[PDB]
Amino acid sequence: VLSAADKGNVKAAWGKVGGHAAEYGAEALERMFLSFPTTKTYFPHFDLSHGSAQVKGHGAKVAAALTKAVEHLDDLPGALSELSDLHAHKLRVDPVNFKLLSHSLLVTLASHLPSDFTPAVHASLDKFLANVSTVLTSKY
Amino acid sequence: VLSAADKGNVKAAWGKVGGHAAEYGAEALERMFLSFPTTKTYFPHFDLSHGSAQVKGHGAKVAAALTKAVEHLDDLPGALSELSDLHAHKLRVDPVNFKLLSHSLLVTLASHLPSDFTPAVHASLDKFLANVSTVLTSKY
Amino acid sequence: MLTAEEKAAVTAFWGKVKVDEVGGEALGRLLVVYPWTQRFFESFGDLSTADAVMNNPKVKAHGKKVLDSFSNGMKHLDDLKGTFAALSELHCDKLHVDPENFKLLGNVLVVVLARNFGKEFTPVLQADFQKVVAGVANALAHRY
Amino acid sequence: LTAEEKAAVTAFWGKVKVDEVGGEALGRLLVVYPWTQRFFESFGDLSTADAVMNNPKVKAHGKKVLDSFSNGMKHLDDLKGTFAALSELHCDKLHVDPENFKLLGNVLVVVLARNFGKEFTPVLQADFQKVVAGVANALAHRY
Ligand code: HEM
Ligand code: HEM
Ligand code: HEM
Ligand code: HEM
DSSP states (O other), X not given: OOOHHHHHHHHHHHHHHGGGHHHHHHHHHHHHHHHOGGGXXXXXXXXXXXXXXXXXXXXXXXXXXXXXXXXXXTOHHHHTHHHHIIIIIISOOOTHHHHHHHHHHHHHHHHHOTTTOOHHHHHHHHHHHXXXXXXXXXXX | OOOHHHHHHHHHHHHHHGGGHHHHHHHHHHHHHHHOGGGGGGOTTSOOSTTOHHHHHHHHXXXXXXXXXXXXXXXXXXXXXXXXXXXXXXXXXXXXXXHHHHHHXXXXXXXXXXXXXXXXXXHHHHHHHHXXXXXXXXXX | OOOHHHHHHHHHHHHHSOOTTHHHHHHHHHHHHSGGGGGGGGGGOOXXXXXXXXXXXXXXXXXHHHHHHHHHHHTOXXXXXXXXXXXXXXXXXXXXXXXXXXXXXXXXXXHHHHHHHGGGSOHHHHHHHHHXXXXXXHHHHTTO | OOHHHHHHHHHHHTTSOTTTHHHHHHHHHHHHSGGGGGGGGGGOOOSXXXXXXXXXXXXXXXXXXXHHHHHHXXXXXXXXXXXXXXXXXXXXXXXXXXHHHHHHHXXXXXXXXXXXXXXXXXXXXXXXXXXXXXXXXXXXXXX
C-alpha cells in the first residue's frame, strides 16, 4: 500500500545503501539490543556482544530480506510469505518489537545517509518498514 | 486481509446485530466519550450529553459505514475512500483513537450478543475493526 | 484516581457479581485474539486452537489467579503502585512481557465483564472499570 | 541513568546546536506523523514537507522544545517535577495523546543520529533512549 512517491523514495534510498546493507543491518540489530534489552530474549542462543559473528550474520539476513522487499514492493505478502510464518507462527514475535527494530533501522540509515535522509525520505522509509512489519505479523 | 473464516464470522455477527446497528453505534460512541474523554475533543461542535440528537445521529452514520464495510469486505479501500480522506487529511484523527472506538464497539457488541460473541467471533470482529481503521488512516 | 462516587459504584458491582470464571475467560480470549501472547504460556500445553485454549485447565486456573490479583488491586485503589511492585518486577525482569500487553488484557477483561453482565454494565460503570484497568496496567509497567 | 551515564550524555549534549535540532525534530514529527499537524493550526503553512521544514513558527517552536529537553538533561533525577507545568499544558489543555510524546522523542533520536553520525554510538543512543522515555513518561504523568 506504499504510494508511487514512497516507492520511488524507498528504491532510491536503498540504492544509496547499496553494498553496505548487511553492515547497516548488523548495526541496527546492535542498536535494538542495546536500547531495548527485552528484544535480546528472542535470541537466547546468541552472543549479542559488540562484534559477535552471530549479530553480523543475522544483520546480513535481515538486510537481504529488506532488499528482496524493495525489489517486490507490489507484492510483499508473497515475497515474505516464509518469513511471516516464521515470525508470527513459530517465533510469536510481539508486534511491538517490529516498531523497535524499525526505529533502530531508521537511526542507522540517518547516521550513514545524512544527505539522503530528508524528511520526505524518512517518512517513506517509515511507511516501508511499517508495511514490512505488517506483512511479517499478518497471521495476527 | 481478513481470512474467509473471519469474513464469515463478521457477516454472521452483523446479521445478528440486524436492526439494532444504529442504536449500537450510538452506544459505542457514548462508551468511547465516557471511557476515553480525550476523544471528546474531536467533537467540540456536539452536545455530548447522554441521548443527544447529534450523538444518536453520528452513531447511525458510523453504523452505516460499518454496514457498507461488511457488504464490501473484499475492497474496503474503495468502499471507504471518501471516509479515509475525511479522517486522515481533513480531521487529522490520531490513529490511537481508532483503537478506542474499536474497543468501545466490541464492548457494545459483547454486551448485546453475549451468546454469539464467542472467542473466535471476537477475534474476527477485532481484525475487521482494525482493518476498517487501517483503511481510514491509510493516508498515514 | 477514581472519585468517591466512582469507587462506590465499582465496589458495589464487584460485590454482587459472580466472577470465578471471568479471569479464565479473559486470559483465554487474550490468547485467541492476540496470538503472540501464547509465547509466554508454552508450559500450559495445548493452545493450538480456540477451543483448545478456552478448554485448557491451566488457562482457567491461571486466569483465576490473575483476577484474584485484580480483585486485590480493587481493595487498594489508593496504592496500585505498591500493590503491584513485586508483580511488575516479575513481569518485566523475569517474564519479559512488553507493557502494551497489560493494556490489552485489561481491555479484554472489560469486554468479558460486558459479555457476562449485560445491561447493568452501563457506559458509566464501564468507564469506571476503564480507570481501574488503566491503573493496574500503569502499576505493572512502572518497573520497566 | 547512572552517574557515569549522565556524564556521557552531558558531554555529548554539549555538542548539540540549540538553534537547529529542535526545529528539525518538530518538522520531521509533522511530516512523518501528519496527524500531529492538528495541534499546530495557528502555525500557518504546513501543507507540504518543504513548507513545514521552512516554516519560521516550526523552527521557533522546535527551539523551545529542545530548550525543554536541555532543561530535562540538567534534572535527570527529577524529570517528573521538571515537566509538571508542560504536562498540564499538553494533557489538560491541549489533549495530546501521550503516545505522541514517545514519537517525538524517537524523532529527536533520529535527528541526533543524522546530525552526529558515527559519534552517536549505539551505547550513547541507548542512554538517550532512556532520557527520551523519561521525558515522555514525565509529560504523560497527569494522565
Ligand atoms: C523488518 C523486520 C524483520 C525482518 C525483515 C526480519 C528478517 C528475518 C530473517 C531474514 C530471518 C532469518 C530467516 C531464516 O533463516 O529462516 C529472521 C529470523 C529471526 N527473526 Fe527476524 N526479521 C524482522 C523482525 C524481527 C523482530 C522484530 C524480531 C524480534 C525482536 C525478530 C526475531 C527473529 C528471530 C528470533 C529469528 C530466528 C533467529 C535464529 O534463531 O536463528 N525478527 N528474521
Ligand atoms: C471504525 C472507525 C470509524 C468509522 C467507521 C467512522 C465513520 C464516520 C462517518 C461515517 C462519518 C461521517 C462522514 C460524512 O458525514 O460524510 C464520520 C465523521 C467523523 N468522524 Fe469518524 N469514523 C471512525 C473513526 C473515528 C474516530 C476514531 C474519530 C475520533 C475519535 C472520528 C471522528 C470523526 C469526526 C470528528 C467526524 C466529523 C463529524 C462531523 O462532521 O460532525 N472518527 N466518521
Ligand atoms: C493486569 C494485568 C496482569 C495481572 C494483574 C497479572 C497478574 C499475574 C499474577 C498474579 C501472576 C502469578 C499467578 C500465580 O500466583 O501463580 C502472573 C503470572 C504470569 N503472568 Fe501475568 N498479569 C497480568 C498481565 C499479563 C500479561 C499481559 C501477560 C502476557 C501476555 C502475562 C504473563 C504472565 C506469565 C507468563 C505468568 C507466569 C505463568 C506461569 O506460571 O508459567 N501477564 N500474572
Ligand atoms: C517530549 C515531547 C515534548 C516536549 C518536551 C514539548 C515541549 C513543549 C514546550 C516547551 C512548549 C511551549 C509551552 C510554553 O511556552 O508555555 C510546548 C507547546 C506545545 N506543544 Fe509540545 N512538547 C512535546 C511534545 C508535543 C507533542 C507530541 C505535541 C503534539 C503532537 C505537542 C504540541 C504542542 C503544542 C500544540 C504546543 C502549543 C503551541 C502553541 O500554540 O503555541 N507537543 N511543547
